[PDB]
A and B are shown apart, each in its own frame.
Chain A
Amino acid sequence: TLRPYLSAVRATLQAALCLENFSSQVVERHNKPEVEVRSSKELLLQPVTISRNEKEKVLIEGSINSVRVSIAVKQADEIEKILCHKFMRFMMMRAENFFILRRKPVEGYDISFLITNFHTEQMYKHKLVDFVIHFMEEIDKEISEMKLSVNARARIVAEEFLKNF
């Protein structure tokens, strides 16, 4: 059931993202996203969650012009935890050129997607949904290969040293 889990997410992100331009109700002449500053209560939508198990959960927090989507990542053991934590902290250094994310995730969550109105304009917003799915598609497998990378390359390193005695 790994496939239909992404489907309902794909079935929710499309519903999530139908936005517009909207200036600040609070401040003169500004345009700041609503799901971050949270100063106008009535605009913020109801935060929803979709999960497959105790762990694989995705939060969506909608507003009038921005949606903060966050993702829990499957962390099977401690050796993948540093594989989880670096792979995040690699890309979170690089959210300036790769620039639709947050720098620091939600407390309890692993990475936070922040799509404004402008990012729905200069990009095809029926495919930014598909990119968010694509990011969850292969980091299941991306970390899965690097475990098999390390458990192979130690075996190359060790067998050389021990036969040399």
Chain B
Amino acid sequence: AYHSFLVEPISCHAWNKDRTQIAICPNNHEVHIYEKSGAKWTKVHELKEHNGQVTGIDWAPESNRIVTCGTDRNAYVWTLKGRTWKPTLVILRINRAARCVRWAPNENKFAVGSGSRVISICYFEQENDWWVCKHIKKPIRSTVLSLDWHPNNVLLAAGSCDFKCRIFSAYIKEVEERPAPTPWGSKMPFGELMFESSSSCGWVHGVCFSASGSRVAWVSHDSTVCLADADKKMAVATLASETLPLLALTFITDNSLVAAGHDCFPVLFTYDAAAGMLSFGGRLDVPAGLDSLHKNSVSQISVLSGGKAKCSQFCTTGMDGGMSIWDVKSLESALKDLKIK
């Protein structure tokens, strides 16, 4: 299954909560929302506000909001007002390009990582009607690359160019009350450093917590992939890739993972918690001038089917206008070397 849109590279993709509409920017000032009409795609919305390029978008699946981050140091919140989407001025108190963004599952705060070695956190205040930015400065020294939320709406992953995946604590104390304790540690104020990774090799392109959020995993530029645990006390496990450079990766259960890269065909993963083994699966796929349906690399992986746990449908959007939609149960049949736990 493969639709293609355009020649331009698209930045990132996101969905509504039913996972029907999709919204992407193909290398321009304009992010376009698309939508199935049967097997026919419909350019339902166009957004023309950013005077620079835009780089990372997330659709808010429940509040019907849209967060932006780009290169003209400006991030805008787009909420549905009837048919015409309307922006929202959000000042991060940073000066350069942002890199990625995603909503916390409370839909009360969003994390922006950028080039000024700081992470701006805007949570919405109500009296001023404002998204007050608050910063996590120490000890980030490089440009923040990928982000991920714990489902508790408290912790926050962080990945930058100093190779060190420093998972954090960003409990905002005035819009959130005192959360439950966490297998990382006890006291969780804002800006609280919790654990710096043991990776001095390869950039940190993609990080993700599990559905528990106790497990967290990351893939690295030097063709490696590494995972750690909150329950097994920060124990970073090591696995090297014997394939091509890679960008995106996601869980499917709590110890079963799927990642694709510059080949744009996947190769599953499962965390053997018993033997303590990150063991790389086997493409789980089955085979211009290219065997993979999409031309360029991946840029993002995300799950169509009901959260990261179930977990069946997932699509691959990259640096070209194609989307290859992949179902797990569609891939369960013809593969003879897959591993699922």
Q: Please give the residue numbers on chain A whose beta carbons come within 8 Å of chain B beta carbons, in ascending order.
A: 15, 18, 21-25, 28-29, 42-43, 64, 121-122, 124-127
Q: Are B97 and A23 in contact (CB under 8 A)?
A: yes
Chain B residues near A42 (CB-CB < 8 A): 142, 161-162
Q: Are A29 and B143 in contact (CB under 8 A)?
A: no
Q: Are A29 and B72 in contact (CB under 8 A)?
A: yes
Complex A-B, nearest 5 residue pairs according to Cβ-Cβ distance, in ascending order: A23-B97, A18-B245, A18-B262, A28-B96, A28-B95
- Interface assignment of B295: CB less than 8 Å from any CB of chain A: yes
Chain A residues near B9 (CB-CB < 8 A): 121
Using A21-B55, A29-B52 as known contacts, list a sample of 10 further A-B pairs with CB atoms less than 8 Å apart, ordered by residue number in A: A18-B244, A18-B245, A18-B261, A18-B262, A22-B143, A23-B96, A23-B97, A24-B115, A29-B71, A64-B203
Residue of A nearest to B141 (CB): A42
Chain B residues near A28 (CB-CB < 8 A): 73, 95-96
Q: Are B96 and A24 in contact (CB under 8 A)?
A: yes
Residue of A nearest to B7 (CB): A122
B277-317 CB contacts (< 8 Å) to partner A: 288-290, 295-297
Q: Are A23 and B142 in contact (CB under 8 A)?
A: no
Q: Which of A23, A122, A126 contacts B115 (CB 8 A)?
A: A23
Residue of B nearest to A43 (CB): B161
Q: How far is the CA of A83 from the CA of B44 in the complex (A)?
A: 59
**Min CB gap B97→A, angstroms:** 4
Q: How far is the CA of A98 from the CA of B71 in the complex (A)?
A: 29
Q: Are B27 and A121 in contact (CB under 8 A)?
A: yes
B197-246 CB contacts (< 8 Å) to partner A: 203, 244-245
Q: How far is the CA of A116 from the CA of B137 in the complex (A)?
A: 31
Q: Are B96 and A29 in contact (CB under 8 A)?
A: yes
Chain A residues near B142 (CB-CB < 8 A): 25, 42
Chain A residues near B96 (CB-CB < 8 A): 23-24, 28-29
Chain A residues near B71 (CB-CB < 8 A): 23, 29
17 CB contacts below 8 A, A to B, read A15-B245, A18-B244, A18-B245, A18-B262, A21-B55, A22-B143, A23-B96, A24-B96, A25-B142, A28-B73, A28-B95, A29-B71, A29-B72, A43-B161, A121-B9, A124-B288, A125-B296
